[model samples]
Target chain A: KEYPAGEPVTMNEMELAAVYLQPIDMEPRGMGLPAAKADVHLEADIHAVEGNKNGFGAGEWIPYLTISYTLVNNDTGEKQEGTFMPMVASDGPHYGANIKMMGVGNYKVTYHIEPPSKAGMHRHTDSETGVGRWWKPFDVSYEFKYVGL
Target chain B: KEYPAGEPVTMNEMELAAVYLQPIDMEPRGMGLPAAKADVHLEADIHAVEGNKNGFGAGEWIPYLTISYTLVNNDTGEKQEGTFMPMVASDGPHYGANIKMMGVGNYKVTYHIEPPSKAGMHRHTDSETGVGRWWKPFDVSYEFKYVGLN
Candidate 1:
């Protein structure tokens, strides 16, 4: 069943509905201790909002989610970049990564969200084989200040 | 003798060698029907080079190591960020993390090393009030691609 070209085609609404970046939380450390150093333990969850509600997530908790970040030093005018992997935990889907700040000052934090690509093939329906896909893309950024290291 | 100010005073080599980034490793996933809508599992470790030679990292393994990372998607030109924490495992000190990949593409990976900052107060050497601190920061980066979900 194909709709007219002008129609708002909802190819994979179900896919997009499942994944997104959780509220970013940068944990604070002891006074004057930069998070980027051993004290910097940042965390967040790529939550599948409507997880396990229906058969959408199969038998798993939610879809696969990963992320990366770009940090620019507002003081020294230097910059740093890296990708953080999600670790396994009891109450999971919450991914986190720690970083060390370059000295201290305001820093721009940029985050990118990577949802799983249900590529390959899947038996979504009893009819024909459904070619699985994913949402376009997503990201967010903000400014944070580090008083001192 | 004390040299005048604005002069170069050579410090002990131990102070310099105490700080550095430990090497990082990014593991690969097995192929299979992709997981549910959003589910990515990743694993890695921050090894302490030549851990205690006597006991192979018995008592001092917990404080010498810790880390973080950044991941990129070259295919879509989109970037995602997060920090990884060590999960429970049988192998001691062999820290590992799990993350779901975006898809099949060459993803540039960057990891930041955060060594222990033995803060608070402690007595390591026989001296006056010692100000506890940590080693310097270290990190590395590279690229890899994920084919399928397994």
Candidate 2:
């Protein structure tokens, strides 16, 4: 069923949330994306934490991140991994990708997050209106139970 | 006063809107951003056109674009320019930058938009999940009147 993968985690001045939703259609339709082969859409909802020092408001989506996810089936040790794409839905912007699960069961989900600079998004460094340097790359993991959508 | 820069323009399967709001504070408090120097926060709201073939739904913000703006004062012939950063507010995500206007007057604002690939956002290309190639870069302009915030 569609639900949060786990509790949100705060790290490196940001909050990272993982979620799953029923597979949905996306643009550039000819590619057959949201393909019938996929089971669910995995998303990483990342944002600046409340009262962050980076000039970004609380809950504002952080752009230019390179987020990759790995899903491991707890019982069988099977795994699936891929990089997430920056996308926007009606609710707002985040990173996501449609995935074919290893079948319904308990699993561990890990996300490897790279900073905005990794994607070539630079920050202003002027004396009057500059921002802090990007944070280092990191990883976070969660326990998830997939019982089929 | 705060308002739309001009009517939204549709180009290359996307709709683009320009808006200006009173300057607002930002994070990384020590960087001195949203500094006292800015006059307004200029935003570019871009989205996929309704029923777009590329998969994005209507009104969904387009990410990873490299958008640059140039503001030219109509009467004084002055100019200010900068690249926009992808950002999100409580309202939603957009590309924007705090701008220091040349002072209260009428002006023309032009935005040069580059495709998402320019920023390293590639779409799936394999059969059964691929997307169309990126559209070429293009420019859109609007007339704005800075009468001071009221």
Candidate 3:
């Protein structure tokens, strides 16, 4: 039913109770994360950046991060790597890195490289769909956290 | 104009050129994070519990790390205080020190918890949207090279 434009149109206690019972949207989406590509566009963001326990983050903080980017070619992707250094916020932000994704294809990077040697380096997700996209993830979903590299 | 089923739609040089100039959807609705229920959740994992900088990594080059988590209340975040031991992966996967988190909101934890920390630590996610819900970051999103506290 539609509300009268000017009426405060408040909900009764029962309705209000139902409202609180509504679900919350936790996992944001997007960013090419090895999860997919080509369709169902999604986006993500890297908000927090900290040190390896350098004195930030409260409550058993684990530190999720994000960095800036653009689409590149496969050859270029092979040559580039990315890093997200969390220096003191008072010092600087983004603390950037490099990468070379090369082409546009669906991918799932839950932190393990082909070589066991690179398993879960700085990039790793804690869940199943723990993948991330290239350009964005926050805009689309809040799934995993990893270093740019 | 539309093409017939399974028909090859031919394109002119000009039309082909247009392929390189199509409008793009630069993600705009993405958010950074959301607020908590005031009731915090915790997932303890190994955080460099007992490392020695002599284990498995990009190379047998760096050190090893081991961490521990207490999954405590945020208002009561604390260190294992002076004597802490972390959870180890193997011979030397993640090397570092024996640090304890007041209970990082979440740890990239091995999807394992004990006494038990179930894979993904579902209880927290089950509370609301569930596991992949909102990413509880910087309590679990940072990287440390491990300088050693002891």
Highest TM-score against the true fold, candidate: 2
In terms of TM-score, which candidate is stronger, 1 or 2? Answer: 2
**How do the candidates score on chain B by TM-score?**
0.53, 0.92, 0.17
Alpha-carbon local distance difference test for all models: 0.37, 0.74, 0.20
> Using lDDT as the measure, what is the rank order of every candidate, best first?
2, 1, 3
Q: Which one wins by TM-score: 2 or 3? A: 2
lDDT of 2 by residue, A30-122 (tens): 333464778887889888876565556666678778888889999899988787888655455678888888988999999999986666543
Name the regions of candidate 1 deviating beyond 4 angstroms: A1-37, A50-63, A89-91, A118-133, B1-150
lDDT of 2 by residue, B1-150 (tens): 347997899998799999987665554334323647777878898988876555465655677889999999998999978888775454545777777778888999999999876665545444444466668899999997878775
Which ranges in model 2 have alpha carbons more than 4 Å from their true place? A1-65, A69-107, A113-149, B29-35
Ranking by DockQ: 2, 3, 1
Question: Which wins on TM-score, candidate 1 or candidate 3?
Answer: 1
After superposition of all CA atoms, the RMSD between model 1 and the true structure is 22.0
Which segments of model 3 are wrong by more than 4 Å? A1-27, A33-113, A116-149, B1-150
